[PDB]
Amino acid sequence: GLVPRGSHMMDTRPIGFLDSGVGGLTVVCELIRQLPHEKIVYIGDSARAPYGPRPKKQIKEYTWELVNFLLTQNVKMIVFACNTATAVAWEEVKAALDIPVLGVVLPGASAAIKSTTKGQVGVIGTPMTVASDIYRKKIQLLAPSIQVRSLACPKFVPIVESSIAKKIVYDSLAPLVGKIDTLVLGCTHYPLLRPIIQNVMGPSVKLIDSGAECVRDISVLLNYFDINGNYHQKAVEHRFFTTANPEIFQEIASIWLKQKINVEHVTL
Amino acid sequence: MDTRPIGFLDSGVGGLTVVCELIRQLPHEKIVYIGRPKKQIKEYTWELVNFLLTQNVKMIVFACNTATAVAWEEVKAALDIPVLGVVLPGASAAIKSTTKGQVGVIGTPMTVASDIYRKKIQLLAPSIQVRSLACPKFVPIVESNEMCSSIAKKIVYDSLAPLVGIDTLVLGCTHYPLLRPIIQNVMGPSVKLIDSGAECVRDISVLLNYFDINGNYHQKAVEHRFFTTANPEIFQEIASIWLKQKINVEHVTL
């Protein structure tokens, strides 16, 4: 990609995102807001969700299909937005690919480590993510002495897709109130409930948005690897794929991205 | 956990300020620090890199700005460990921090002459305006704060006058951050100052995570090593003051 009226060539490839559903779209929203000039290719494998309870073998197998589909789309980078896919095959995919491979869990974990005051970290997410305990594992793999308390908030995802909402958050986070100094939003759906969560936890707790942290890593890594696009070139050629139920996918997508986005249904 | 030290190379001693930034943001990481035509500066840099590699560093940071301009990309393409300079991160921060796209940059005659800052800024964001000033009068002062502020203001302004009245100023020299308060004053309150060294340390964090080479978080690194090819005496005095702790240096002959 030659810069118009310019002299240098800049990468024109898009950044790829894989997920077993629509939650990852919030990481996509963060990308658009921070790096408006970067193209996106999103593949949501809802047809085989939930990944969570399935055997590692299948998860590795499904993840790779998502990876290869992204590669056929000529992506310069791949972002894991699915917690289970990240826990099971993120490591091997990253070691094998020739392009940068990132996840959302890692930067959220790291930011928690760097932001805690007394060493009391909280993690809220889905029963599955809390069940895998992946955030605590990543956090403690780097700083084993950090105390991590993880709580499932099963009413959160439904609320995302009102005074009742307020009550629900207050009751769901109650067990955490006053017991931590840092809280990881361990579900990509939760960034939409941030203001209420901040209100329930009080000003004494710092909120860590894993998706935003991840998007910050993307910015530094694109530059580090010299695959950044022209900063003045607004991007719009965004591709969205799903392996199932495109109707609701477009519903949720159009809403969060605040623009009618077009979803393409595909078969892997 | 990778207990290896992070390496820092410098043509001078100003890079010591990036080290300080490292200590402040990453108290747990150990440090190994060591601090004319092109081909010559290139070779000299390689010798500095060779030294750091014998010290078993897991990463190399170019503190100096002229060294970065001259050999950073060459060394980075040739090593198996991460390598970064301060220019790109300063460049990237200015672009994100710029309001009207009017960015200025001050540094050493050598640094400005290379025009590395406008080049990297425009390389990422081609339509951003960049004004690069020269300040050969700004030499490393140990405790510039001990000098009467009104004296420093006159001297600072005397070099930064042409630039007065750009919306972002990049500190293109590693020891310039020691003169920040004055620079901030002389440049007025509507000029956001960019500290390249500090932006670099923020990048270091991302890359230590990316390459999975973070050190042990539950301890304060206390085994840093400072080397110089020159006057070890003047060096320790400078370093002890900037790091607010009596550090011990070792003279080496490259």
Q: DSSP secondary structure string, B170-237?
A: EE-STTGGGGHHHHHHHT-TT-EEE-HHHHHHHHHHHHHHHTT----TTS-----EEEESS-HHHHHH
Task: Say whether both B126 and B152 belong to one domain.
Answer: yes
Task: Say whether both A6 and A85 belong to one domain.
Answer: yes
What is the C-alpha radius of gyration for chain B, rounded to an integer number of angstroms? 18
The breaks in chain A (C to N more than 2.5 Å) occur after 161
C-alpha span between B244 and B246 (Å, rounded): 7
A259's tokens: 């623009």
- Amino acid identity at B66: T
Task: Say whether both A122 and A195 belong to one domain.
Answer: yes
B199's tokens: 């932006």
Task: Say whether both B124 and B191 belong to one domain.
Answer: yes
> What contacts B28, CB < 8 A, 6 or more positions away?
B215, B216, B217, B218, B219, B220, B221
Nearest to A221 among B95, B206, B217 (CB): B206
Cis peptide before A50 (omega within 30 of 0): yes
Kindly give the interhelix angle for A210-224 and B196-210, rounded to the nearest 10 degrees: 100
Measured between CA atoms, how close is A243 to chain B, in angstroms? 30
First-to-last CA distance in chain A?
30
Kindly give the interhelix angle for B87-97 and B116-124, rounded to the nearest 10 degrees: 60
CA-closest candidate to residue B178, choices B241, B113, B223: B241
Could you give the number of structural domains in chain B?
Answer: 2
Beta strands in A126-171 (DSSP E): 147-152
Task: Say whether both B243 and B212 belong to one domain.
Answer: yes
Q: How many CB atoms lie within 10 A of CB A29?
A: 20
Provide the 8-state DSSP code for A228. Answer: P
CB contact under 8 A, B124 and A232: no
* Distances from the Cα of B72 to the Cα of B35, B67, B76, angstroms: 15, 7, 6
Task: Say whether both B66 and B126 belong to one domain.
Answer: no
A250's tokens: 């477009």
Question: Is the CB of residue A107 less than 8 Å from the CB of residue A80?
Answer: no
Torsion angles phi and psi, residue A241, rounded to 5: -125, 150
CB contact under 8 A, A217 and B207: no
Print the domain residue range for A47: 1-103+211-268
CA-closest candidate to residue B120, choices A15, A228, A5: A228
Give contacts of A219 with chain B, Cβ < 8 Å. Answer: 92
Active site residues per annotation of B: 64, 173
Question: Is the CB of residue B160 less than 8 Å from the CB of residue B134?
Answer: no
Q: How many CB atoms lie within 10 A of CB B180?
A: 13
Kind of pairing between the strands at A40-44 and A77-80: unpaired
How many CA within 13 A on the CB side of residue A259? 10
Instruction: Return the H-helix or E-strand segment holding A15.
Output: strand A15-19
Resolution of the PDB structure in angstroms: 2.2
Is B114 marked within a binding site?
A: no
CA A56 to centroid of chain Cα atoms: 20
CA-closest candidate to residue A187, choices A16, A49, A24, A20: A24
Give contacts of B92 with chain A, Cβ < 8 Å. Answer: 219-220, 223
CB contact under 8 A, B123 and A219: no
- Method for this entry: X-ray
Task: Say whether both B185 and B201 belong to one domain.
Answer: no
> What contacts B252, CB < 8 A, 6 or more positions away?
B34, B51, B227, B228, B229
Torsion angles phi and psi, residue A9, rounded to 5: -100, 140
CATH of the domain at A217: 3.40.50.1860
Question: Is the CB of residue B72 less than 8 Å from the CB of residue B85?
Answer: yes
